[PDB]
Design a protein around this ligand. Structure first.
Ligand code: HEC
Ligand code: HEC
Lengths: 86, 86
């Protein structure tokens, strides 16, 4: 699986730039928060774990997770590993 | 159906403020573009009609439409009529 392609095509980049906080936190910031926590990042992406980066705006991000409900666990992992690479 | 509640809960407001263009066009701008074109706005929301407001960023908005695939046509109309009210 291609985490970069999934990220692109689900429209995530609109709120998540690599190195700058905008509507959502940067990928760099998310990657740092979830360093060594890949399993938890996958859980988050499933709606299974709490926001740990910007809880003030948790409810804004939550609905975006609905996009990901067609992905396998391997694809979710690939998406997580793309995020973590930043 | 409650178009305002649908808008809120699908997370649309993150990119669409009432009166200011941000990541996406303002609701006011969209409402003006689709004045007298409710049917076309509903088609757009279904993935059925082209972007007429900001075609440069059509591909950014498109994936957001996937959220709306659980809505009835009446609910899509309510969402359209909430947008149009601006
Ligand atoms: C409409 C803007 C928007 C879009 C589009 C968006 N996000 Fe977010 N995202 C946010 C906001 C706001 C936050 C901060 C709230 C939070 O931390 O949960 C956030 C936070 C996150 C976080 C950190 C969660 C945490 O632990 O705090 C991850 C991971 C994430 N988004 C992934 C994604 C992915 C993957 C996509 C594409 C499926 C996506 N986002 C699309 C707005 C967006
Ligand atoms: C990640 C930011 C983002 C989110 C969240 C978002 N949009 Fe958009 N939207 C855009 C962008 C960028 C445009 C400009 C491209 C375009 O006009 O299609 C746009 C344009 C539109 C338009 C005008 C389409 C046209 O004819 O040009 C409508 C209607 C719209 N969005 C409705 C919605 C609704 C309803 C939701 C919630 C289900 C939503 N948007 C969520 C970014 C977003």
């Amino acid at each position: 699986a291609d985490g970069k392609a999934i990220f692109q095509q689900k429209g995530c980049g609109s709120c998540h730039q690599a190195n700058v906080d905008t509507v959502g936190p940067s990928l760099k910031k998310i990657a740092q928060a979830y360093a060594g926590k890949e399993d938890q990042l996958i859980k988050f992406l499933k709606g299974e774990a709490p926001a740990i980066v910007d809880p003030a705006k948790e409810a804004i991000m939550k609905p975006q997770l609905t996009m990901l409900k067609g992905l396998s666990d391997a694809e979710l992992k690939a998406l997580a590993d793309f995020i973590l690479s930043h």
